[PDB]
């Protein structure tokens, strides 16, 4: 009955949306961008090393001051390091030792952490008493938490393994918007420079684009071929990169509705776990599963550097807000500041 | 003066490091386990809301930390990677609608061949052995039409018969074990090991089988450090 009719309009809509992308695919940044100046081999060396964690590090996030750094490990710790002098400013003992994400507030007052407990706990650093304690216990999700990001001191965007993203209100503790439309587990998210839009790559090989004002899904991209494990916004706010489990990274775009470049090498066979951009959006440091941080190039698509100072897989990667340091975490509890 | 706040941080880095050292001892003194039992197989009572139901229990001054993963979705490929540091993976199988055994045979193969879980041993708990002795003794013999190599199968010479069991069930119980012990030997490399066990979900000593099996994993892990084994 209508089941077959529903597929006739869906296939035509998928073809109508595919032909429109082909019309805007004049060059795909492959024939005109070849006449640029490649920066060549950019060699980086580890300047600091944080070996205070006991279990595998799963996430990290820099603050607005670019000095402090919070790291989450699988031992029930939320140590807040001082990247300048290597000082453990705080050591928050978490309830559930299964932590899969962490974030730093844009003001440096609060810190969040999720994990397999489905709870996004908020901790207040600047307390009048001087100690640290959980400020809010956000509950409601039905799947493991993958990534959390702060809009402001009272708003926080999360993403769980229940194919749905959320937007909570720390003041009351209840969510206001529940983004829905993904088929696979959402693995990461990244806020735009302007806190109005954010992307979220899921396990269904589809990277969408939401608007924090409503529950509307602006766009959807399906360039990759496996579970998208990482995502990050371009410093300009009109593009974003996507790492997936099929050993390739693709730079998408919002105004083009399709992928521009596809960074891939014949030797790499391991999936990407973490990606991020530089201050000028010229470098794309992808964290592969081969214990190496292959520094790609957003323009030339050529691997211009490799960071191999890690024993285990690189589970997280964060560049500073000013571009001075690139802190990469790994499963051997060694967070080296590059 | 501008260096007086440094000792205030070095003392903050002293008590925290003193706490990061007393916590390092209690962390490595507890062995984290993973209960990945199949649904409707008595996984909760195999040793006897929230994303993970912790379970603290000690066996001879050894506090284990089991994590029953509940209230999660169907797809497990992404969240099974967080359990690579655990000592073992308690795998409970329902030995008895659709095909229940093949659903647990294809899952064990995925865990065994997962790149992150190739160094994590798996403890196998073949549950519902009391119900197994009733399906093969009389009624629908669903083990014969769901497996074509069971008719031309004989019980091995290493079988230890138990009192009160039918010989047709012993040939069936050990057949399911050989189906699990075929993937763990062919696709294996020698890093992780599989320990099969027989349970009826009512055993009052299930904490001893996990205790002895965990002692064999740490010994085999220590033997790998000195390049002995």
């Amino acid at each position, epitope marked *: 009955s209508e089941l077959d009719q529903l*597929r006739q309009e869906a296939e035509q809509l998928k073809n109508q949306i595919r032909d429109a992308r082909k019309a805007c695919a004049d060059a795909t940044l492959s024939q005109i961008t070849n006449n640029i100046d490649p920066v060549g081999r950019i060699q980086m060396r580890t300047r600091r090393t944080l070996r205070g964690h006991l279990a595998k590090i799963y996430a990290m996030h820099w603050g607005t001051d670019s000095r402090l750094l919070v790291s989450a490990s699988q031992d029930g710790k939320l140590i807040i390091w001082d990247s300048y002098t290597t000082n453990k400013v705080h050591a928050i003992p978490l309830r559930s030792s299964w932590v899969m994400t962490c974030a730093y507030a844009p003001s440096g007052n609060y810190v969040a952490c999720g994990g397999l407990d489905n709870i996004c706990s908020i901790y207040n650093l600047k307390t009048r008493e001087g100690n640290v304690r959980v400020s809010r216990e956000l509950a409601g999700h039905t799947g493991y938490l993958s990534c959390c990001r702060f809009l402001d001191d009272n708003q926080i965007v999360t993403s769980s393994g229940d194919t749905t993203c959320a937007l909570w209100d720390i003041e009351t503790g209840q969510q206001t918007t529940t983004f829905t439309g993904h*088929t*696979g587990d959402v693995m990461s998210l990244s806020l735009a420079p302007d806190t109005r839009l954010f992307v979220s790559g899921a*396990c*269904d*090989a*589809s990277a969408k684009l939401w608007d924090v004002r409503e529950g509307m899904c602006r766009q959807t991209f*399906t*360039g990759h*071929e*496996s*579970d998208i494990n990482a995502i990050c916004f371009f410093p300009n706010g009109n593009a974003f990169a996507t790492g997936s*489990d*099929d*050993a390739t990274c693709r730079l998408f775009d919002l105004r083009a509705d399709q992928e521009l470049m596809t960074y891939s090498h014949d030797n790499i*066979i391991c*999936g990407i776990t973490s990606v991020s951009f530089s201050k000028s959006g010229r470098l794309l440091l992808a964290g592969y599963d081969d214990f190496n941080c292959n520094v790609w190039d957003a323009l030339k698509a050529d691997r211009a550097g490799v960071l191999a100072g890690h024993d285990n897989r690189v589970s997280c990667l964060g560049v500073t807000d000013d571009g001075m340091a690139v802190a990469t975490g790994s499963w051997d509890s060694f967070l080296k500041i590059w | 003066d501008q260096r007086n706040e440094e000792k205030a941080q070095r003392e903050a880095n002293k008590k925290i490091e003193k706490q990061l050292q007393k916590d390092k001892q209690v962390y490595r003194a507890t062995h984290r386990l993973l209960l990945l039992g199949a649904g409707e197989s008595g996984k909760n009572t195999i040793v006897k809301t929230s994303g993970i139901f912790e379970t603290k229990f000690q066996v001879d001054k050894v506090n284990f930390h089991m994590f029953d993963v509940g209230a999660q979705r*169907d*797809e*497990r*490929r992404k969240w*099974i990677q967080c359990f690579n540091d655990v000592t073992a993976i308690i795998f409970v199988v329902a030995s008895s*609608q*659709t*095909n229940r055994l*093949q*659903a647990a045979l*294809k899952l064990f*193969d*995925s*865990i*065994w*061949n*997962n*790149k992150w879980l190739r160094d994590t041993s798996v403890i196998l708990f073949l549950n519902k052995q009391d119900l197994l002795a009733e399906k093969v003794l009389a009624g629908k013999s669903k083990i014969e*039409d*769901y*497996f*074509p*190599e069971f008719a031309r199968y004989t019980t091995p010479e290493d079988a230890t018969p138990e009192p009160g069991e039918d010989p047709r069930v012993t040939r069936a119980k050990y057949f399911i074990r050989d189906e699990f012990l075929r993937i763990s030997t062919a*696709s294996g490399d020698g890093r992780h090991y599989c320990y099969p066990h027989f349970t009826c979900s009512v055993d009052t000593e299930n904490i001893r089988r996990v205790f002895n099996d965990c002692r064999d994993i740490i010994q085999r892990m220590h033997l790998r450090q000195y390049e002995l084994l």
Partner: nanobody
Amino acid sequence: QVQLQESGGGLVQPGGSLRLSCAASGFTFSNYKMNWVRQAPGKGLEWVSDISQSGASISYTGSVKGRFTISRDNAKNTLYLQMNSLKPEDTAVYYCARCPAPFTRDCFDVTSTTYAYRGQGTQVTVS
């Protein structure tokens, strides 16, 4: 865009034959494993048979071992399931599931209640 479309179907008598041609467009067909999952009426998704990356291992379930035959054509990206001597209990939809990640010997969540790299299925009913 991982798109898996199948063909075949219709009514066949017990003991007949059918060829389920599963198309695959949008990904490298060689780098990924292939699977066959069927959904009985009012029952859960069960695994039938899988094939290795390039014709290496051909595993079956209990009921289809010897009766069915799965083969892939890497030059045409078409997965086949040569069915022969069917039984009146084989009346079920036939999805063409793909393994989640490439160049691995592990396959996870192919029989899940909801998965992304699966097909629409064909109503292979037996008269």
